[PDB]
Each structure stands twice: as structure tokens, then as C-alpha cells.
PDB file of C-alpha atoms in Angstrom:
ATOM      1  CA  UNK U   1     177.175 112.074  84.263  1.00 25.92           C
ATOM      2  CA  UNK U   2     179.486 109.028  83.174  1.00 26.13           C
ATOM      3  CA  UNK U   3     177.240 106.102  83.471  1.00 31.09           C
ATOM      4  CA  UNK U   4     176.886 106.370  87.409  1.00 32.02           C
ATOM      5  CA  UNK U   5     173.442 106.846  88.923  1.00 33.38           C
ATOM      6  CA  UNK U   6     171.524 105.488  92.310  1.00 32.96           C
ATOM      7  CA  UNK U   7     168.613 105.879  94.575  1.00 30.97           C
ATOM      8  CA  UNK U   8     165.939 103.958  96.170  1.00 29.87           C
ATOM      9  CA  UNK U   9     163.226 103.962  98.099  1.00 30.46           C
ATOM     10  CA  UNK U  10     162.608 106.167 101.271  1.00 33.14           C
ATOM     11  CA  UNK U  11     160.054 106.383 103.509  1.00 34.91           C
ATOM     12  CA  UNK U  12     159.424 108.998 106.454  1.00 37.66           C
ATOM     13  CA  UNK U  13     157.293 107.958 109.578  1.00 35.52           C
ATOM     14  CA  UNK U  14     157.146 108.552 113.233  1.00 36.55           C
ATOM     15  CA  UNK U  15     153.515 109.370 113.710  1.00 36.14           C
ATOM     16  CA  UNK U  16     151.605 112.581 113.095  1.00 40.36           C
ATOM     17  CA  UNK U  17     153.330 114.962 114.060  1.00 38.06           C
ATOM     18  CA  UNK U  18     156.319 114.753 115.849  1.00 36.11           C
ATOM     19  CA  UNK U  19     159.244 116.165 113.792  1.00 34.55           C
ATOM     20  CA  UNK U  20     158.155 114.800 110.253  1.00 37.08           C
ATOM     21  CA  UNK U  21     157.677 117.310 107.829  1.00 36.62           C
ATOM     22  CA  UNK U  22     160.016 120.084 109.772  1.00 36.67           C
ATOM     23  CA  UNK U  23     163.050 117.566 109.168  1.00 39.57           C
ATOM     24  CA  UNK U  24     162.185 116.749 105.616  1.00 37.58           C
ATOM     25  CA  UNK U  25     162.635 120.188 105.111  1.00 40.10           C
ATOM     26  CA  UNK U  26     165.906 120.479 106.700  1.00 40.62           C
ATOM     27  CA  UNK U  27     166.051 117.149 104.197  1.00 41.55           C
ATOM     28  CA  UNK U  28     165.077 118.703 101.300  1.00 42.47           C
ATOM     29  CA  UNK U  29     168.501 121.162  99.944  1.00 41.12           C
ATOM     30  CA  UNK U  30     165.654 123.599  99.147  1.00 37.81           C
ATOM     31  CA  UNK U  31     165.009 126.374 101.368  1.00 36.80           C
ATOM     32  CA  UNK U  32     161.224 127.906 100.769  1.00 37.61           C
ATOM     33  CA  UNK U  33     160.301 125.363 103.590  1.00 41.65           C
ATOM     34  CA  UNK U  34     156.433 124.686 102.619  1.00 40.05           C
ATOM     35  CA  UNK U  35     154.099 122.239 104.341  1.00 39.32           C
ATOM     36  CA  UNK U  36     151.047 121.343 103.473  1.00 37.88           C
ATOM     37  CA  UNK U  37     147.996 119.377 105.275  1.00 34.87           C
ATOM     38  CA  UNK U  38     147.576 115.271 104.793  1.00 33.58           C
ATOM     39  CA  UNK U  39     144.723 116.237 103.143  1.00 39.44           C
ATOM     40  CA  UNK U  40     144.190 112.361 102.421  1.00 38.78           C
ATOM     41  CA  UNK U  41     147.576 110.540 102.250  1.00 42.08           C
ATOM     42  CA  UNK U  42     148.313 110.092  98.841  1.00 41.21           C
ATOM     43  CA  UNK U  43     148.095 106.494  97.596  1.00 37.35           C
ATOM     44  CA  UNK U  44     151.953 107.095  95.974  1.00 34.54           C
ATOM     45  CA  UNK U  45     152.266 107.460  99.785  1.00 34.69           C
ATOM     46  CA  UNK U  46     154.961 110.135  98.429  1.00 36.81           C
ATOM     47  CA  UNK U  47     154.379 113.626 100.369  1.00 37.80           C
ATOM     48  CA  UNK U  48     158.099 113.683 101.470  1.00 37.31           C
ATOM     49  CA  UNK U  49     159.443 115.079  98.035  1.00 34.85           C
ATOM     50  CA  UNK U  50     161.942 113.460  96.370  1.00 36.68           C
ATOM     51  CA  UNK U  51     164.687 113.887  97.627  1.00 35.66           C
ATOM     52  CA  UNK U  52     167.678 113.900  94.652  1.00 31.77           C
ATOM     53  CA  UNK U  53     171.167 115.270  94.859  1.00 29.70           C
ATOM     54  CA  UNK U  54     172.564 113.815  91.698  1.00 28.35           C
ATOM     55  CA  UNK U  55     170.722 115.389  88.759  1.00 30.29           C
ATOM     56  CA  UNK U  56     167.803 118.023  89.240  1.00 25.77           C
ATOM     57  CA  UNK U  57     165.478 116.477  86.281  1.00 26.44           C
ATOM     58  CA  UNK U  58     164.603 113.279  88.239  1.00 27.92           C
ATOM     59  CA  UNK U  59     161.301 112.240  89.184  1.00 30.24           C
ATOM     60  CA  UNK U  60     160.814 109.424  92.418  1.00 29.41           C
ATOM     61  CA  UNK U  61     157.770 107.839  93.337  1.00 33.44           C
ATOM     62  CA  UNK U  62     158.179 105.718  97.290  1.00 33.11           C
ATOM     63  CA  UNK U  63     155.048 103.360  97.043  1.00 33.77           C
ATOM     64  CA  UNK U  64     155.536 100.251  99.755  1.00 38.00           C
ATOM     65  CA  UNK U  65     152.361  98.857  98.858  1.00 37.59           C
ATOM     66  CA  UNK U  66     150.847  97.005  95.969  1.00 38.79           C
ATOM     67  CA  UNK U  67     147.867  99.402  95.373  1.00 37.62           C
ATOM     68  CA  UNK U  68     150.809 102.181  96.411  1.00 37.33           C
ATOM     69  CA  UNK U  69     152.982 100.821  93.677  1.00 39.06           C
ATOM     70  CA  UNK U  70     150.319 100.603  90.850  1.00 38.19           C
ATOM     71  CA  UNK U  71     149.460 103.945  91.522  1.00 39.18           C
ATOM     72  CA  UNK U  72     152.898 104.657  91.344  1.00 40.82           C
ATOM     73  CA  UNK U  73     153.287 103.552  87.936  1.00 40.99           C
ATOM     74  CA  UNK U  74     150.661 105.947  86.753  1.00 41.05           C
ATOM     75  CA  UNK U  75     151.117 108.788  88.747  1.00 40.73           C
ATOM     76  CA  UNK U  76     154.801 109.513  87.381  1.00 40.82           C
ATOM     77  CA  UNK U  77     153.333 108.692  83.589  1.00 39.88           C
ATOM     78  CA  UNK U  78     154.302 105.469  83.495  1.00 40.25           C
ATOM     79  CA  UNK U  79     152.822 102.570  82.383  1.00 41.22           C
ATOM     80  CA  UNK U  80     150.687 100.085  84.621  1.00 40.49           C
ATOM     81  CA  UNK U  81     153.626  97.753  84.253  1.00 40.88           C
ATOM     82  CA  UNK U  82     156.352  96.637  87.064  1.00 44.84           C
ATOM     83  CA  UNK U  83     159.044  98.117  88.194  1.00 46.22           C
ATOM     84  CA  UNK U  84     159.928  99.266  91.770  1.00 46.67           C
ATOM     85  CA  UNK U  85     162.179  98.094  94.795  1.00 46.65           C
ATOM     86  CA  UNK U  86     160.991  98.474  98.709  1.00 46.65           C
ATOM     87  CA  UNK U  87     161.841 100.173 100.858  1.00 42.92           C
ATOM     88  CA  UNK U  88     165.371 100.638 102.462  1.00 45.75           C
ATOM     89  CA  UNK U  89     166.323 103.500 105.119  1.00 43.90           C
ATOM     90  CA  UNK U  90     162.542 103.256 107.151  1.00 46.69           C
ATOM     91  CA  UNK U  91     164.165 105.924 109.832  1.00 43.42           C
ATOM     92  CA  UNK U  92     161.876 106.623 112.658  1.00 38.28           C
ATOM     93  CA  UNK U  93     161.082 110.135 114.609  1.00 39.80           C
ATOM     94  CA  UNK U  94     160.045 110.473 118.299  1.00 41.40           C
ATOM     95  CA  UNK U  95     159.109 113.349 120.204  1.00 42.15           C
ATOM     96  CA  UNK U  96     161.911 113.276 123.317  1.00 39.61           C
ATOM     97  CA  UNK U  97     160.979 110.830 125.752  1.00 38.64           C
ATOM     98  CA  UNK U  98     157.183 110.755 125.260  1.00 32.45           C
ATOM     99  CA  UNK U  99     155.219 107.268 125.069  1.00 33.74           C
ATOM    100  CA  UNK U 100     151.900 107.312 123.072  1.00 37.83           C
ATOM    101  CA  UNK U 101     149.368 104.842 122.363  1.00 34.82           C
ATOM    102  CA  UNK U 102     150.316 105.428 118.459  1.00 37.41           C
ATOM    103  CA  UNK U 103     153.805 105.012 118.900  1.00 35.13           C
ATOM    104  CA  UNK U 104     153.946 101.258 118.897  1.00 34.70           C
ATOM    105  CA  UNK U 105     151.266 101.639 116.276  1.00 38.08           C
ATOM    106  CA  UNK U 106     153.586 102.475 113.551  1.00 35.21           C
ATOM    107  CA  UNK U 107     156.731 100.596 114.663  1.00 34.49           C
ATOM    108  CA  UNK U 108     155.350  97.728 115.339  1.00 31.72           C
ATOM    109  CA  UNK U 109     154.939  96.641 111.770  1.00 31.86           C
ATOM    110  CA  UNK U 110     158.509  97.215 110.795  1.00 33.22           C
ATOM    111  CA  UNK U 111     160.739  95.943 113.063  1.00 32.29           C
ATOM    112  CA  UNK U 112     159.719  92.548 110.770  1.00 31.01           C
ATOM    113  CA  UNK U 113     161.143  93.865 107.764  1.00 29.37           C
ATOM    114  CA  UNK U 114     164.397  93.747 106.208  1.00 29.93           C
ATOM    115  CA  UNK U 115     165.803  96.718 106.288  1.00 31.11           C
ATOM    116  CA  UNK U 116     167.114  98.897 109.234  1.00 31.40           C
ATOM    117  CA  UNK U 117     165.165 101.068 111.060  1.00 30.24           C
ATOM    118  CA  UNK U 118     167.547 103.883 112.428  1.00 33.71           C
ATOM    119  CA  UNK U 119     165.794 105.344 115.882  1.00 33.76           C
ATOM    120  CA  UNK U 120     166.188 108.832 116.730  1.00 35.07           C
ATOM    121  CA  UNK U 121     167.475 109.732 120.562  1.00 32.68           C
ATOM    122  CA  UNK U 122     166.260 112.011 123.133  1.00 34.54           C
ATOM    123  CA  UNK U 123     168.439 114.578 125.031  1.00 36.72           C
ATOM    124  CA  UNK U 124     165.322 116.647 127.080  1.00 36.09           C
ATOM    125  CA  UNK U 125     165.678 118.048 130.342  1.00 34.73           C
ATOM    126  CA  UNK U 126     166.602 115.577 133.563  1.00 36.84           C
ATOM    127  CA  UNK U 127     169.405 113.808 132.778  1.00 33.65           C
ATOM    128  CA  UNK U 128     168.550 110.591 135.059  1.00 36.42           C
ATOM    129  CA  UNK U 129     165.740 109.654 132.577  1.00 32.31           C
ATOM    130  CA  UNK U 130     167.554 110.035 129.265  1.00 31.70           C
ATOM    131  CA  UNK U 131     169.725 107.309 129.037  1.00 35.04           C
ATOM    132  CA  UNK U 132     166.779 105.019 130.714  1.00 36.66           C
ATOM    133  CA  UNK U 133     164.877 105.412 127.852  1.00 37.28           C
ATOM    134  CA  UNK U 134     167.982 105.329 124.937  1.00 37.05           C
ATOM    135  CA  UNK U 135     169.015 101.763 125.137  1.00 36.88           C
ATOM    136  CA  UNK U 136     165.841 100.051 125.090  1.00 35.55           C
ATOM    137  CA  UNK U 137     164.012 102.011 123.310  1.00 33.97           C
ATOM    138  CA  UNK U 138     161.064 100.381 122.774  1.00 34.21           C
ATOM    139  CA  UNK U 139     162.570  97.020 121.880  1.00 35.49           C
ATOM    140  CA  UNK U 140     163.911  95.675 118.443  1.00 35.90           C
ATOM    141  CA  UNK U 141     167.852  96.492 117.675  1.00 33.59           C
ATOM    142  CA  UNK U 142     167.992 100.308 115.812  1.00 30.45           C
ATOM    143  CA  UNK U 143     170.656 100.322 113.214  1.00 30.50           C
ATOM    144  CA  UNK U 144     172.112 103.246 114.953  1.00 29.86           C
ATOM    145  CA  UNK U 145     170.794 105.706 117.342  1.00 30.73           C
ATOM    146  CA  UNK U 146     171.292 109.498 116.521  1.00 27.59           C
ATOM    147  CA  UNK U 147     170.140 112.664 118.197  1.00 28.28           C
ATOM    148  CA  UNK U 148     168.705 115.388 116.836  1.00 27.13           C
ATOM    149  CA  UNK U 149     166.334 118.356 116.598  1.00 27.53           C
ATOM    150  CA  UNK U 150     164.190 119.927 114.204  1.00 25.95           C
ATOM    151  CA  UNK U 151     164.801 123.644 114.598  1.00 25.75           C
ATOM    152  CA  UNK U 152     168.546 123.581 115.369  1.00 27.72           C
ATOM    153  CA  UNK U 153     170.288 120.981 113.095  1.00 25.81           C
ATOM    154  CA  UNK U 154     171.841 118.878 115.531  1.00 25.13           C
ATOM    155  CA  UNK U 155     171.977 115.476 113.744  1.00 27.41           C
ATOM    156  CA  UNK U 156     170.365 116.616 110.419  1.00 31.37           C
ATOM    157  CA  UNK U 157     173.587 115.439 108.073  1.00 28.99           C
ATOM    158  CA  UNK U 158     174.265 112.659 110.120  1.00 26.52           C
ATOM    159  CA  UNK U 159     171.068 111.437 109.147  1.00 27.65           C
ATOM    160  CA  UNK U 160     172.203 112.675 105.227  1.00 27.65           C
ATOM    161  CA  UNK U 161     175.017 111.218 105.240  1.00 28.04           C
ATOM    162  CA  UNK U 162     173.557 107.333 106.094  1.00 27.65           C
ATOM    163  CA  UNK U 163     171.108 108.392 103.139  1.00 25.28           C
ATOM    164  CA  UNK U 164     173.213 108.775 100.398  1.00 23.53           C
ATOM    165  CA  UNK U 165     175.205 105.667 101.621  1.00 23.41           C
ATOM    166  CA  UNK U 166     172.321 103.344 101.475  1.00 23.49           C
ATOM    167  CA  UNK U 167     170.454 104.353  98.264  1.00 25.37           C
ATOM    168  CA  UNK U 168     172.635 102.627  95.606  1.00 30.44           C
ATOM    169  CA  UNK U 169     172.477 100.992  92.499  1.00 32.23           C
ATOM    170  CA  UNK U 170     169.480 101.466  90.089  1.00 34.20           C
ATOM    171  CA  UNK U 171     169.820 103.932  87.040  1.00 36.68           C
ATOM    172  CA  UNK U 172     166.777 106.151  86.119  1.00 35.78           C
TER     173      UNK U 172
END
């Protein structure tokens, strides 16, 4: 390019199962949509691709952890050295208006952060029900709230485009 890169740090959660992987894809420009099994998470903690617009030849690594990051800097042949931001765009995904036990277990150590969180919205069947559970959501203030699906691409580049926006900075 002309002296004009960016990216950061990404991370995908919303407990297992429950739109993950079937959105990276929709994520990921790529088409041959292939998913695979945890098989162990990864200590890179980095089995959501890398998602990279800019230039093809580009290799990411999203650790959020010290062990994460060391193994980072290893994985990606690099030296055990230091170099690597946190975490930025930690958006969540929820299954329509269903309330597990494992929900909470995952958001709850986040909301503490700082960095937005960006909570998905629900649009199931009854509408008296929806918008009860769209506001409060939980609790904690959601940078912004956007539906979407995983088959049908409802909010998909919605979700791009406040991607792009808040990777920045940072060049190779």
C-alpha cells in the first residue's frame, strides 16, 4: 500500500454454540464455509481465522491472556518476546430470547473491561416478549444493539462495518 495499515485484536464468544462459528463464516469473505470441532481450545485462543481485508499475506494471532500471548509469540514464528495489544470489539452472540446457566458465565467477566461489548438482539416469534428482553438485556450498557441471524444475513455487515471502524492503528 502507501504506508497505511491497521488491525487489532478480536475475539468471538457467546457460549458454545449459539451462532459462533456459522457467523464467522458469514465473517470470513471466504466462501468454502468449514468448521471444525474445539477439539481443545487452542491456547492462541485463535479458532476464528483471521480475519484481514487489507492485504491477503497477513498472519494474526488474538491471545487475551498471558500464557495466550506467549504462545502467541511462538505459534506465528515469532520470538518469545513482547508485543501484542488486548482486546477491542469483544461482541457477544445469544440464541433469541433464551436464558442459560452459561450465559452469565461468559459475560460476566467482561462487562469490567474496557472495551465495548456490542450485544446482539432477538426478533423470535411473540412480539410482547421481544422488546422485554432488548433493553435490559442482562444488565451492563451494550455499545449498540443489532439484530441478526446466522443463515439469512440480516445484520451480518452491520456488524462488518463497526469492525473495520474499530481495528486501527498498528502496522504489521
Amino acid at each position: 500500500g502507501s504506508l497505511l495499515r491497521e488491525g487489532m485484536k478480536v475475539v468471538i464468544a457467546g457460549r458454545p454454540n449459539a451462532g459462533k462459528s456459522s457467523l464467522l463464516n458469514a465473517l470470513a469473505g471466504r466462501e468454502a464455509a468449514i468448521v471444525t470441532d474445539i477439539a481443545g481450545t487452542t491456547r492462541d485462543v485463535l479458532r476464528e481465522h483471521i480475519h484481514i481485508d487489507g492485504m491477503p499475506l497477513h498472519i494474526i494471532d488474538t491471545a487475551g491472556l498471558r500464557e495466550a500471548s506467549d504462545e502467541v509469540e511462538r505459534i506465528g514464528i515469532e520470538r518469545a518476546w513482547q508485543e501484542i495489544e488486548q482486546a477491542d470489539r469483544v461482541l457477544f452472540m445469544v440464541d433469541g430470547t433464551t436464558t442459560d446457566a452459561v450465559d452469565p458465565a461468559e459475560i460476566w467477566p467482561e462487562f469490567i473491561a474496557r472495551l465495548p461489548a456490542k450485544l446482539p438482539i432477538t426478533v423470535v416469534r411473540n412480539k410482547a416478549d421481544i422488546t422485554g428482553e432488548t433493553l435490559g438485556m442482562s444488565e451492563v450498557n451494550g455499545h449498540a444493539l443489532i439484530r441478526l441471524s446466522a443463515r439469512t444475513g440480516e445484520g451480518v455487515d452491520v456488524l462488518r462495518n463497526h469492525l473495520k471502524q474499530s481495528m486501527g492503528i498498528h502496522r504489521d
